Amino acid sequence: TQPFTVLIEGNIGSGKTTYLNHFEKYKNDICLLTEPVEKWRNVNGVNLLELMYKDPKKWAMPFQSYVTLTMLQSHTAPTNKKLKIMERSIFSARYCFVENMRRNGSLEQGMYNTLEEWYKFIEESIHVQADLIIYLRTSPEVAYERIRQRARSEESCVPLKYLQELHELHEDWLIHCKVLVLDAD
Amino acid sequence: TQPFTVLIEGNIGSGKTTYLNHFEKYKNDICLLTEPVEKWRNVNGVNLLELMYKDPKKWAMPFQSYVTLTMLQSHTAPTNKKLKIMERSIFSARYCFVENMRRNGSLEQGMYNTLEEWYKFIEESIHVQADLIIYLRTSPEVAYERIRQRARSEESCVPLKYLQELHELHEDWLIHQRRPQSCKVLVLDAD
Numbered sequence A: 001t002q003p004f005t006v007l008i009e010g011n012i013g014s015g016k017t018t019y020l021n022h023f024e025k026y027k028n029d030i031c032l033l034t035e036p037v038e039k040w041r042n043v044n045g046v047n048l049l050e051l052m053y054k055d056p057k058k059w060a061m062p063f064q065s066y067v068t069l070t071m072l073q074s075h076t077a078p079t080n081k082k083l084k085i086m087e088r089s090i091f092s093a094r095y096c097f098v099e100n101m102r103r104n105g106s107l108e109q110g111m112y113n114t115l116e117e118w119y120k121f122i123e124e125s126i127h128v129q130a131d132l133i134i135y136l137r138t139s140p141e142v143a144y145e146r147i148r149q150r151a152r153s154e155e156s157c158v159p160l161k162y163l164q165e166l167h168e169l170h171e172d173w174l175i176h177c178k179v180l181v182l183d184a185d
Numbered sequence B: 001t002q003p004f005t006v007l008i009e010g011n012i013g014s015g016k017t018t019y020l021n022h023f024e025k026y027k028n029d030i031c032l033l034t035e036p037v038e039k040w041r042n043v044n045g046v047n048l049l050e051l052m053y054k055d056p057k058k059w060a061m062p063f064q065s066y067v068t069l070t071m072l073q074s075h076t077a078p079t080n081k082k083l084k085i086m087e088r089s090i091f092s093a094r095y096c097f098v099e100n101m102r103r104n105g106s107l108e109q110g111m112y113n114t115l116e117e118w119y120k121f122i123e124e125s126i127h128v129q130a131d132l133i134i135y136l137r138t139s140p141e142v143a144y145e146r147i148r149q150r151a152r153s154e155e156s157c158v159p160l161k162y163l164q165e166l167h168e169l170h171e172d173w174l175i176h177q178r179r180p181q182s183c184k185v186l187v188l189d190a191d
């Protein structure tokens, strides 16, 4: 029992937070689920996001596992509203962020495989509500400027190359469920 | 929709496999779920059990996460039989095996916390069927002997100290009732 669901997808620095704020005035009639970064930063006093960025070969696995969980919690969360808008999803976690961490060697085969088994079990047990994806398409260099533009201790070591990798993965998934592409440049 | 469920608990080398085999002849009327070791040994060609034992600080986290999943799959698996018997459970994973890996330093705080968030979400979303626990109570020394008397596998180098740690945790849970079980425990002398 889930309302019409829109997912906001795009690279780091694609303006999703700014875009999602346009909907804040409609909170009375729309279910607005911000990406649970605050959950990730305080898993009982542990900042998994910081640990992942600081040491990905060690922390990519637990971090992405906790991402999967929190996204699943958002996807299945109860609301009486007839429209739901989600910042990101279990799908970008899987198809972009986990895939990239596998490709750059931060997730070893067995760790990726464990994450993959969870996704399979989720998809087999739960139909995940996804009616529309709004893809905030950017160029990696503009995304880079947006990250530096905002003070975020965690992401302040992310190379342009990493953003390029995440860009191509969003392109594969979303270009190469209805997808609406917006020029977020 | 799950039948009456019995969970077989106890240390490594407590004789659970031998004990579960006594029920094999009753497969027609009982749902028999062996501990999914074969799944753990072959996660797309990856032996997570071997990797965990060889390098626990690296592999305890993904291993126990996969344990959680496979146990959950067993707990929720469909059967038309009116009795189900399970070798181990999500509860021993949480209360003994994960707790011990946390205490010995193989699971850092953040990794333990991630595993714990999954357990919470599972208990809040799914009532896990558990009607009876049969505790195959052994002494660590006997559990140790059983391991060293059988064929070599991933387990075969676990120190006696590790088995003593797991023993006390099974006692805390199943005898002291210091973990939130609320379930009848039948203790058997598996020595």
Ligand SMILES: Nc1ccn([C@H]2C[C@H](O)[C@@H](CO)O2)c(=O)n1
Pocket: A012, A035, A037, A049, A067, A088, A092, A093, A094, A097, A098, A155
């Ligand atoms: N599946 C995800 C989702 C988000 N992030 C990171 C990218 C940003 O740095 C931050 C906020 O979205 O979290 C991530 O590594 N993996």
Ligand SMILES: Nc1ccn([C@H]2C[C@H](O)[C@@H](CO)O2)c(=O)n1
Pocket: B012, B035, B037, B049, B067, B088, B092, B093, B094, B097, B098, B155
């Ligand atoms: N949660 C669990 C369950 C089992 N095992 C191990 C103990 C045995 O060595 C092997 C087969 O039971 O798996 C484990 O490390 N963690």
